[PDB]
Amino acid sequence: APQQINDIVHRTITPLIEQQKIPGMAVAVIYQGKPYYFTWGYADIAKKQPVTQQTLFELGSVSKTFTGVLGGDAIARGEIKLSDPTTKYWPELTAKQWNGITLLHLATYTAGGLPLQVPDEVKSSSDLLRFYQNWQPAWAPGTQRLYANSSIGLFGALAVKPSGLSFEQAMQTRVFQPLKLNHTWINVPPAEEKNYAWGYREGKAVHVSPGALDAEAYGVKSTIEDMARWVQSNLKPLDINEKTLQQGIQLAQSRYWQTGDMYQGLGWEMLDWPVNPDSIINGSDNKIALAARPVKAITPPTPAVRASWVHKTGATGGFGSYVAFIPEKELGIVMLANKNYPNPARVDAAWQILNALQ
Numbered sequence: 001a002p003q004q005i006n007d008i009v010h011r012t013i014t015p016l017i018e019q020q021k022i023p024g025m026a027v028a029v030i031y032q033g034k035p036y037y038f039t040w041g042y043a044d045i046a047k048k049q050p051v052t053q054q055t056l057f058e059l060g061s062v063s064k065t066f067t068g069v070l071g072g073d074a075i076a077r078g079e080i081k082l083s084d085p086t087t088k089y090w091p092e093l094t095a096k097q098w099n100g101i102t103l104l105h106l107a108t109y110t111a112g113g114l115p116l117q118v119p120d121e122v123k124s125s126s127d128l129l130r131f132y133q134n135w136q137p138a139w140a141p142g143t144q145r146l147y148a149n150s151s152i153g154l155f156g157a158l159a160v161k162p163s164g165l166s167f168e169q170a171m172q173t174r175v176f177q178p179l180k181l182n183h184t185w186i187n188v189p190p191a192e193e194k195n196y197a198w199g200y201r202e203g204k205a206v207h208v209s210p211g212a213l214d215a216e217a218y219g220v221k222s223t224i225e226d227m228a229r230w231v232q233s234n235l236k237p238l239d240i241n242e243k244t245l246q247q248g249i250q251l252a253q254s255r256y257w258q259t260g261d262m263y264q265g266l267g268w269e270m271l272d273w274p275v276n277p278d279s280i281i282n283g284s285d286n287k288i289a290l291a292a293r294p295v296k297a298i299t300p301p302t303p304a305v306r307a308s309w310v311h312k313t314g315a316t317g318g319f320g321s322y323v324a325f326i327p328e329k330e331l332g333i334v335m336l337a338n339k340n341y342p343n344p345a346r347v348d349a350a351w352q353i354l355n356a357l358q
């Protein structure tokens with residue numbers, strides 16, 4: 001890398017790893033559209049395996065950006081509409097509270113208080129039906145945002161129904177393959193296990209456990225190289241050859257709802273650039289990000305704004321991830337770590353790096 005990129009990345013990330021006691025970390029900076037990679041520490045402390053550019057990390061809720069884009073592609077294919085009722089794709093969902101709740105509301109956490117987690121008790125497809133049939137909204141649809149796996153996860157499951165493909169097969173064929181993300185997995189294959197980092201929670205080595213709607217809400221694993229290519233594709237969608245995927249990317253960065261200075265996309269969240277660093281840093285703390293907040297509809301949604309800070313945090317029990325990019329500047333960053341450390345620290349580091357390069 002250019003010395004300037006090397007210096008800022010090292011000066012920011014080294015103290016971060018020390019302060020947060022992060023075992024292993026990988027970072028990619030996309031600068032003028034080209035990726036530069038950095039790695040530190042251990043993918044597996046016990047076995048002394050270093051983090052490399054091929055190490056797989058659990059992306060946690062950064063997975064929601066893939067779900068958002070896959071749903072976008074399904075809209076662009078004419079398979080689904082965001083204005084369609086949820087019941088069009090799940091006719092057994094007959095309970096009356098669902099009248100008025102559309103795929104838009106599911107994709108954007110605005111259905112009226114679907115919960116952050118699907119209950120652990122829910123396993124089977126019939127367990128899921130019963131959970132959604134019995135769920136009671138706190139609020140009318142399209143009035144309040146409450147970030148929720150049970151919301152976007154159901155969107156991802158329904159979005160692929162008309163294709164007839166399983167969610168994983170759809171993601172593989174329609175998103176990962178066309179973008180050449182050949183080391184990004186919903187289920188890590190045996191051949192790639194040697195590269196799968198452990199996560200660390202309270203000093204214990206851990207991987208994510210199976211759960212309902214896991215693939216759709218938090219289940220993607222990827223390397224720093226593939227995540228850089230993910231950022232390049234979302235920075236410059238018009239260079240993607242597959243037409244519906246190009247559109248699906250653009251649709252996922254449309255602005256559907258506003259709360260404070262943030263806009264809700266499909267998976268992605270966006271703010272006008274230049275941003276107030278306090279606004280994104282403080283806003284990323286779970287005390288704000290997981291809170292129930294009134295939303296203003298953006299009628300109609302604003303198509304992808306190039307002058308935006310587009311981002312998503314992600315975590316699992318043992319991993320912490322962050323992606324941000326600014327289309328107008330051809331600039332972005334991916335940070336993957338195998339410890340779940342506080343969101344504001346991630347965002348502070350990313351802003352320090354991107355602000356210095358912008």
Ligand SMILES: *[B]([O])([O])C1=[C]N(C2=[C]C(Cl)=N[C]=N2)N=[C]1
Nearest residue numbers: 060061149211218314315316317
């Ligand atoms: B996301 O905000 O990172 C996210 C991840 N999870 C989650 C849930 C379960 Cl049961 N297991 C791992 N991760 N929820 C939200």
